[PDB]
């Protein structure tokens, strides 16, 4: 669960990506691809290539998730039941590859934000990141 | 993988008793109906809808007692898992674009059947043995993913 | 989410267990340090060999929360706050561990209750042990 | 571990870089506070009940620095990471019963740490190979667990 400080510091931190989300989207994504080969079998129909931009059009996709559920700190569940339903019931994604994408996020943000990625900084993006994973994961069974 | 020969001496010996058919039928069925996200490779084996759908399920069944069978195989390498199944590893990655964690789930069902076929002579130490077997198969089928 | 029907199901399977939870317990915690070694980690106070008194006592404790759970199906949370405490703030079990002691119940359950651990009680009680396992560990952080 | 000599080359070239000192307070204080489960080893460390109180805390510090001094030694032998480690994978085993699942934790903090530190410099291939690298040394350690 967020507390007050978790959402304030996902508030703030998520602030400051601004304009950067799709970019950063995109990265975590390559960073992801890259790093945990094994979930590259969920996009078989796209272009892996450094700056492809089914990449880049992807990316954007879930960065404005993100940043929807941010904005909806509060709401979340609610926020992304459209995605839950689609992640449940069409992709169907191994719920293991919603924490490998997370982390993947987390080291994009720590890049991108020397100055505000701070321990508490860090631990309220990953207690928020996890929550995302488990909205989205809710309606497998 | 590292089996004890007394490890592998009760995996082989239990394995001798398996109905690879049903077995393999039983587990399959069970993967789909307990992960049913593991259902995504398989809409054209038709009616998945419900647990007897799935369970009584012609292609379920045949595409069971087709991966048990390739199971099996390993057993007669379970020093080289590794390159027994080289070929399929790519396959699944290349081609049927299956993420290798469905094999660890299917590794726990399979566990799960075992057991409930073999009950009391499905012992701590015999499932320690079995763990240690389908964790070397899910490695070995993980094993040429890029 | 455990629907009306996995419920039913978890009820009925547990109902079965009845007056061995005890002895399916303690032998659920035999397999899991024999399958999954890391486990023991966390017991090192135990005396771990085979029909040791303290696995076998801790085995009906386990149980027995697992029956209050059966009971208390609709307000686990509630039902099980002051044991979250306990592994959150005193046990402090890492997350992945509950995973491993789910699956050694259910083959526990599979191996003597043929007859009842059919495909759908199956993929019910594993619902079950996951949604207890995610009570437990519902205030880590 | 199996790493590209361009993946090697690329541990080493940046891991020459980092303040071993400072990095490994860094990813040890950040694991206690991300990870607040993980505290359950550091009692006698006293208080971490903050964020600062964590990454502040001296014994935090001075204990980060013999993780990583350790974990740095390993770098100079990616070729024989079970061997370099056999001895402090017993000791985390036997002796302060240490679940390995922190291991990988721990790599994961340092990759984001590593991060932090390099920016534009821990590149969607540099990040890759030192996933392989904590994940190779997650493994060393975990190794003589029984
Ligand atoms: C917190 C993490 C995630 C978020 C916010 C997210 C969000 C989204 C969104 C917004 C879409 C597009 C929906 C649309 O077209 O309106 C999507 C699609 C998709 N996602 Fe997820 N997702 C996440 C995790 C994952 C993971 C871990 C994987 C696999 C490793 C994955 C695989 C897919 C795939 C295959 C598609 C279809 C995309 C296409 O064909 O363009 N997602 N996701
Ligand atoms: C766990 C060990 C497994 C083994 C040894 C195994 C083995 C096999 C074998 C031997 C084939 C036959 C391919 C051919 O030559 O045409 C096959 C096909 C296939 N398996 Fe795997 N399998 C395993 C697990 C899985 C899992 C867990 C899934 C997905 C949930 C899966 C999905 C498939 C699919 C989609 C095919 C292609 C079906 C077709 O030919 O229509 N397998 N498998
Ligand atoms: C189904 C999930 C679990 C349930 C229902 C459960 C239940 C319990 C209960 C009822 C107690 C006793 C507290 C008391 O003394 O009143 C306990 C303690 C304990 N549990 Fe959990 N537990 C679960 C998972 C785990 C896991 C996965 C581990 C680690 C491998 C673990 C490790 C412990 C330890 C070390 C103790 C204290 C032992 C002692 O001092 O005797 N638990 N648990
Ligand atoms: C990830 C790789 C790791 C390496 C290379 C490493 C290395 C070391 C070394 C060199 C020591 C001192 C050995 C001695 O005193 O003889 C030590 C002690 C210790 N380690 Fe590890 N460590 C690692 C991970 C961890 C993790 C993740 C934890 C738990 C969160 C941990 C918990 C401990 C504890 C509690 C001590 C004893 C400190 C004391 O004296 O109170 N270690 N480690």
Do not use: I
């Amino acid at each position: 669960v967020l507390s007050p400080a978790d959402k304030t510091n996902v508030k703030a931190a998520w602030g400051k990506v601004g304009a950067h989300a799709g970019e950063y989207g995109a990265e975590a994504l390559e960073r992801m691809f890259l790093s945990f080969p094994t979930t590259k079998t969920y996009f078989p129909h796209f272009d892996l290539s450094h700056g492809s931009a089914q990449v880049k059009g992807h990316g954007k996709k879930v960065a404005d998730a993100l940043t929807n559920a941010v904005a909806h700190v509060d709401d979340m569940p609610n926020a992304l039941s459209a995605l839950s339903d689609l992640h449940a019931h069409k992709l169907r994604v191994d719920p293991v590859n919603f924490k490998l994408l997370s982390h993947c996020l987390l080291v994009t943000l720590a890049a991108h934000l020397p100055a505000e990625f701070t321990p508490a900084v860090h631990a309220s993006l990953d207690k928020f990141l996890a929550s995302v994973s488990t909205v989205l994961t809710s309606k497998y069974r | 993988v590292h089996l004890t020969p007394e490890e592998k001496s009760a995996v082989t010996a239990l394995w001798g008793k398996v109905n690879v058919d049903e077995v393999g039928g039983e587990a399959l069925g069970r993967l789909l109906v307990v992960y049913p996200w593991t259902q995504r490779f398989f809409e054209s084996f038709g009616d998945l809808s419900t647990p007897d759908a799935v369970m009584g399920n012609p292609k379920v069944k045949a595409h069971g007692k087709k991966v048990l069978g390739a199971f099996s195989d390993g057993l007669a390498h379970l020093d080289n898992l590794k390159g027994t199944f080289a070929t399929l590893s790519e396959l699944h990655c290349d081609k049927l674009h299956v993420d290798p964690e469905n094999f660890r789930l299917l590794g726990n069902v399979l566990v799960c059947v075992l057991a409930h076929h073999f009950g009391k002579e499905f012992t701590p130490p015999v499932q320690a043995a079995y763990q240690k077997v389908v964790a070397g198969v899910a490695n070995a089928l993980a094993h040429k993913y890029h």
